[PDB]
């Protein structure tokens, strides 16, 4: 198998925000182009 080593351990911020695409907004926008 794999050899998962048994280890001996234990011895202000500003990021960006993602968005989501609206299939409806886009499927109609595309359908508007071809038209």
């Amino acid at each position: 198998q794999v050899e998962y080593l048994d280890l001996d351990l234990d011895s202000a911020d500003e990021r960006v925000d993602y968005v989501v695409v609206d299939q409806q907004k886009t499927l109609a926008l595309k359908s508007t182009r071809e038209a």
Binding site: D6, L7, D8, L9, Y18, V20, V21, T26, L29
Partner: protein, 206 residues
């Protein structure tokens, strides 16, 4: 160093063929989907290590905690003596073994934070200036940052089964085919902004 689609034996295969003593890489965990594995080479043999993914932080089932997988792997590259096993022998993450890039197009910037992709577009970018970068919060996935007094709109790209989709809209065989489609069929965010990909913000030193 992060190899997206390789197995433990495959990692071992790479480390033994391409790598030297001190080489390493990171990969997804097969035995515990969600977690990640750190395969290292030492004394001509390989050592796999379990990376815990809680969702709120990453760690090696103990020790120091980190927000991102890369922040973890960097820390142990800079601190070679912290990663010890009960035996006492040290595991040193030294030479990163690099995989193929997704796309050679110069609109791909590989490792690049959203803050740094923001600075990039708000200094040498314009409306419709876009790039593609590695998603730090979701290793394996990618990001389409687009400039739309300047704010960019980041969009996650899901990489599953070696396929690409943006919001599960359509299937594409490569990052290029996906970026080719949405240049022709722009996407629209929730607020309602249309994301037109006008011109790419290419890389500097190819």
């Amino acid at each position: 160093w992060f190899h997206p689609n390789i197995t433990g034996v495959e990692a071992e295969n790479l480390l033994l063929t391409r790598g030297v003593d001190g080489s390493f890489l990171a990969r997804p965990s097969k035995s515990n989907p969600g977690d990640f594995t750190l395969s290292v080479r030492r004394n001509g043999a390989v050592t796999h290590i379990k990376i815990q993914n809680t969702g709120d932080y990453y760690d090696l089932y103990g020790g120091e905690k980190f927000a991102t997988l890369a922040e973890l792997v960097q820390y142990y590259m800079e601190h070679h003596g912290q990663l010890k096993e009960k035996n006492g022998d040290v595991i040193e993450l030294k030479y990163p073994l690099n995989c193929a890039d997704p796309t050679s197009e110069r609109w791909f910037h590989g490792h690049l934070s959203g803050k740094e992709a923001e600075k990039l577009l708000t200094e040498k970018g314009k409306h419709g200036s876009f790039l593609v970068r590695e998603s730090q919060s979701h290793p394996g996935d990618f990001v389409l940052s687009v400039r739309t007094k300047s704010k960019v709109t980041h969009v996650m790209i899901r990489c599953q089964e070696l396929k690409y989709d943006v919001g599960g809209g359509e299937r594409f065989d490569s990052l290029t085919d996906l970026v080719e489609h949405y240049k022709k069929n722009p996407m629209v965010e929730t607020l309602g902004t249309v994301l037109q990909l006008k011109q790419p913000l290419n890389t500097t030193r190819i």
